[PDB]
Amino acid sequence: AAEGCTNQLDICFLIDSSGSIGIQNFRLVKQFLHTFLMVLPIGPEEVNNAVVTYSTDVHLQWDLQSPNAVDKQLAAHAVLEMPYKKGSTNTADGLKACKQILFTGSRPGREHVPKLVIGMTDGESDSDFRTVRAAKEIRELGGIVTVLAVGPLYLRADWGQLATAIKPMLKEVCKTLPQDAICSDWSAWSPCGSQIRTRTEVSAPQPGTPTCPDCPAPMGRTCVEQGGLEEIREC
Numbered sequence: 317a318a319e320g321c322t323n324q325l326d327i328c329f330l331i332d333s334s335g336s337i338g339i340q341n342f343r344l345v346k347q348f349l350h351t352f353l354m355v356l357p358i359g360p361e362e363v364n365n366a367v368v369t370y371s372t373d374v375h376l377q378w379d380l381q382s383p384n385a386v387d388k389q390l391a392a393h394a395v396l397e398m399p400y401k402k403g404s405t406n407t408a409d410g411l412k413a414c415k416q417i418l419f420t421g422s423r424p425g426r427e428h429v430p431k432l433v434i435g436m437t438d439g440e441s442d443s444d445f446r447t448v449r450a451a452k453e454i455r456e457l458g459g460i461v462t463v464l465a466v467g468p469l470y471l472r473a474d475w476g477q478l479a480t481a482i483k484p485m486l487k488e489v490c491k492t493l494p495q496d497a498i499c500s501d502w503s504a505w506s507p508c509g510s511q512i513r514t515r516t517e518v519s520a521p522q523p524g525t526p527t528c529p530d531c532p533a534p535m536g537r538t539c540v541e542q543g544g545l546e547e548i549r550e551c
């Protein structure tokens with residue numbers, strides 16, 4: 317929301333690879349994703365990323381349960397290796413893929429973390445990124461859908477100025493995302509047996525903006541959810 321946003325995200329990058337993009341513009345998208353992943357706090361406890369390419373059919377590059385989902389350097393290298401497969405623009409099936417990954421394919425702990433779809437497309441499917449039932453379903457499940465059309469959660473950029481869209485895209489997403497509770501720092505370890513330290517919830521979690529009329533938004537982590545208010549060590 318305002319004042320900030322959570323670090324625990326699941327992001328499915330949905331990349332158009334149609335013939336209306338071309339092998340040239342596809343390389344720009346990959347390099348855009350390369351530097352984009354460089355800015356995101358990619359990590360097992362932070363942001364998890366999945367990448368899906370599509371044209372006539374859907375091509376899963378890697379999902380959230382892959383080692384690339386939690387390693388920044390590993391993931392950044394991989395998006396550059398992504399093969400260009402020409403065809404039509406089957407965004408519908410692509411969104412169904414991101415839906416499957418985000419809501420059924422999470423890492424063991426992260427089923428209820430905020431779900432985010434970042435789609436990149438051209439003049440096509442910009443209105444079908446809202447119209448298609450798959451995108452509607454992601455929204456009513458609490459998921460967030462962002463689209464970058466090249467050539468508020470809808471952004472426009474030209475092929476020569478793609479990277480200029482990164483900062484404003486992060487800006488809009490952070491407003492839609494919830495802010496976790498703000499906890500105090502841990503107290504010193506208590507004397508023994510077993511050592512125990514505590515902390516306080518200074519500010520309450522702030523929910524994010526609903527993605528559609530009257531549909532659920534993530535409520536953000538309480539301090540109890542962010543690792544509890546107490547920790548116990550043994551001596």
Ligand SMILES: *[C@H]1O[C@H](CO)[C@@H](O)[C@H](O)[C@@H]1O
Nearest residue numbers: 499500501502503515547
């Ligand atoms: C308590 O736990 C550790 C202590 O080193 C840190 O992650 C942090 O200071 C937290 O408040």
